[PDB]
């Protein structure tokens, strides 16, 4: 059976673009498409795709459940078995839901987090989606309660593969493949197991109206970059003479700092000890 | 002794042609005993040698969980590699990992190994001291400072000193009759005319275990080292091996040539002559 795939994403906004490729017998060459129920009834009146089916711009008509068949001459029908199903979901059709993390977006490695997706509109289904090429969204039924519909996605045990940016979408009853606009993005970050840095202040944590205060984040580990976080910033690290890597944040509130390496924005070290300014 | 246990991981991206694939195989010496393929319906660590098949449910459950985690980890590692080398998400890339332990006659640890490669080239390796790393380029250097921060080498050292050696010992015990009893080669020499002045003498060794073996051709006691056709050792298919060594000889001097065979399944080294 052929392998059907959507590039770059199966979850696609209106006005966007998505390409369907059908790989069969080491060729993307000659295939026909089908929707979810007219299973043996090819779409576009049985149009043959001599090329990967590029949809651009994407409309809600494109949304649906696709299968493909490859041209196989000298064969029971002249066509292969059905391919893997690929669902094209078109977003941007309703008001966006809200998404929040419990207890928070910073998640210790090996631990669990609940991503809650809720809405004013009575959505029948919710989809959790991680920003990335070739990714599948997770579906949950919407619980209706007190005039709002909601769904609790459980993510864990937390590893780097689950870190990243998440959006949730809603869908109503009669258009399952037509999703709402994306929720405001949520950056889920895994902390650890990289060793925690030390946090200090210059000249100190006690500051009054007039003068400067700079937080120094230091570690023997070669962190490329330090993040400063207050309860409720980003700077490159510099290697000091005593072989420590350090960053200096020129500024109250309680602060912690997190080390991190290059090309890896969603994985931070264990948090430093708290330092209140 | 001596013996070794190795694990081989292969992780492959292949946009348009399939989902990322993770394959793992386990070897004791030259014998494969386990495998994992993430392209199955419900992927499970599976036996490949009969002497591991009577291991219980607990073993296959543990190993399958471990392997699923490894598959996820190495998929994400393909993504990370893409960012490291600034490559497009349309290309096909491969991560390979081999790790494991060597033990001696008494089962004590002799050596630890953990090497990783990206697109066929050495990426990062655990040093002999099992407490440091060696990186081949800047991306690998990023990985190194990550692993040093995470103290990976110590956990690895822990695995290699304990679990790896103990399970290797248990395996060497499970299949002693096939792993620790060397199968000697069945040997014979064949003659194949080339010209009417030249002829090929071919020394054959068949059905031997383990794979390591020495086949030499001597012309009056001297090793025809750099004029010998030595084909790569190959599997018979029944967990034994085959090898041959050809030498081209002037016709009429077949007598002056002898084939010397050494293998641990042989009490004394063999010398063969064509007749």
């Amino acid at each position: 059976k052929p392998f059907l795939s959507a590039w770059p994403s199966a979850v696609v906004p209106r006005g966007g673009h998505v390409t369907l490729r059908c790989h069969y017998r080491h060729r993307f060459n000659n295939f026909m498409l089908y929707k979810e129920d007219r299973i043996h009834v090819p779409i576009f009146h049985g149009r043959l795709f001599q090329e990967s089916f590029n949809m651009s711009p994407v409309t809600t008509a494109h949304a649906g459940n696709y299968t493909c068949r490859g041209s196989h001459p000298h064969s029971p029908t002249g066509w292969s078995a059905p391919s893997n199903p690929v669902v094209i979901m078109v977003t941007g059709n309703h008001r966006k839901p809200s998404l929040l993390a419990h207890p928070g977006p910073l998640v210790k490695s090996g631990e669990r987090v609940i991503l809650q997706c809720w809405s004013d509109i009575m959505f029948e289904h919710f989809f959790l989606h991680k920003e990335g090429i070739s990714k599948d969204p997770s579906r949950l039924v919407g619980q209706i309660h007190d005039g709002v519909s909601k769904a609790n996605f459980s993510i864990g045990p937390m590893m780097l593969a689950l870190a990243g940016t998440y959006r949730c979408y809603g869908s109503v009853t009669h258009t399952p493949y037509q999703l709402s606009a994306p929720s405001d993005p949520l950056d889920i970050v895994v902390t650890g197991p990289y060793e925690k840095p030390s946090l200090s202040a210059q000249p100190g944590p006690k500051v009054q109206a007039g003068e400067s205060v700079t937080l120094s984040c230091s570690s023997r580990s070669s962190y490329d970059m330090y993040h400063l976080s207050r309860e409720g910033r980003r700077l490159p690290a510099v290697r000091k003479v005593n072989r420590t890597f350090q960053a200096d944040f020129p500024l109250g509130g309680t602060y912690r700092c997190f080390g991190s390496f290059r090309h890896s924005p969603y994985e931070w070290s264990d948090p430093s000890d708290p330092l209140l300014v | 002794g001596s013996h070794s246990m190795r694990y081989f991981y292969t992780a492959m991206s292949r946009p348009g042609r399939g989902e990322p694939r993770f394959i793992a195989v386990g070897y004791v010496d030259d014998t494969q005993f386990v495998r994992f393929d993430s392209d199955a319906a419900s992927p499970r660590m599976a036996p490949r040698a009969p002497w591991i098949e009577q291991e219980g449910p607990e073993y296959w459950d543990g190993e399958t969980r471990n392997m699923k985690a490894s598959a996820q980890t190495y998929r994400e590692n393909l993504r990370i590699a893409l960012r490291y080398y600034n490559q497009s998400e349309a290309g096909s890339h491969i991560i390979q990992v081999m790790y494991g332990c060597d033990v001696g006659p008494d089962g004590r640890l002799l050596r630890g190994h953990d090497q990783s490669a990206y697109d066929g080239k050495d990426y990062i390796a655990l040093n002999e001291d099992l407490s440091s790393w060696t990186a081949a380029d800047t991306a690998a250097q990023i990985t190194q400072r990550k692993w040093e921060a995470a103290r990976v080498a110590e956990q690895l050292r822990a695995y290699l000193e304990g679990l790896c050696v103990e399970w290797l010992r248990r395996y060497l015990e499970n299949g002693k009759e096939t792993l620790q009893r060397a199968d000697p080669p069945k040997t014979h020499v064949t003659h194949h005319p080339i010209s009417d002045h030249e002829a090929t003498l071919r020394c054959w060794a068949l059905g031997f275990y383990p794979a390591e073996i020495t086949l030499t051709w001597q012309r009056d006691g001297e090793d025809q080292t750099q004029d010998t056709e030595l084909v790569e050792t190959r599997p018979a298919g029944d967990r034994t091996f085959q090898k041959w060594a050809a030498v081209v000889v002037p016709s009429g001097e077949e007598q002056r040539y002898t084939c010397h065979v050494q293998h641990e399944g042989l009490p004394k080294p063999l010398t063969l002559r064509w007749e």
Binding site: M159, L160, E267 | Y7, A24, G26, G62, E63, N66, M67, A69, S70, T73, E76, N77, I80, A81, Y84, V97, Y99, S116, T143, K146, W147, A150, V152, Q155, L156, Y159, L163, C164, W167
Partner: peptide, 9 residues
Amino acid sequence: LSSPVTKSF
């Protein structure tokens, strides 16, 4: 037995 040690790049 295979390694339980995560090797995240």
